[PDB]
Amino acid sequence: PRCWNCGGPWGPGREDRFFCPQCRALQAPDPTRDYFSLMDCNRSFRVDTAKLQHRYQQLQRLVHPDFFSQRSQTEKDFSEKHSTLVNDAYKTLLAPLSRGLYLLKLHGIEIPERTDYEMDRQFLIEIMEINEKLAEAESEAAMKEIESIVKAKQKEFTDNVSSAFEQDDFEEAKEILTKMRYFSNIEEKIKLKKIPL
Ligand SMILES: [Zn+2]
Secondary structure, three states: OEOOOOOOEOOOOOOOOOEOOOOOOEOOOOOOOOHHHHOOOOOOOOOOHHHHHHHHHHHHHHHOHHHHOOOOHHHHHHHHHHHHHHHHHHHHHHOHHHHHHHHHHHOOOOOOOOOOOOOOHHHHHHHHHHHHHHHHOOOHHHHHHHHHHHHHHHHHHHHHHHHHHHOOOHHHHHHHHHHHHHHHHHHHHHHHHOOOO
């Protein structure tokens, strides 16, 4: 690893290698750098979103294409690349759901796309019950009950998946996170139904 302007060696040291100490040029982003690192926090399901938002700004102060409009094409390139990554990381870590799923990827676990079959019975039952309820839900208050029901589950699940990580129990975390995916959809459908008011 070396600088595109100098040839200055990338030090085998600490992480934030945004600028070349030798020539001040904006460097190519490290593909290997995970989002928790880029957002300067521990690999953890638990994430301080006030801090996160602050980091997001610090970095966007450094790499956003606005500051590179008058600079070389190479720097414009990298400025755009970085700024995109910064956005990804931020969005990914901000949402507990995407955070959970991202946390699993690093721990080397890939997720099947909401595979409806690999699921257990009791949960399936819950899902078709919620469905029925929502389908039946036309009144504004019957609408509230579902929201409650859904949000009460969401909390329970967050607590659970938090534990799963605390214990390194990724097979469990993958389970619960696959569940949380369902309820997110249901949430979005409710919000979509809630538009006309
Ligand atoms: Zn350099």
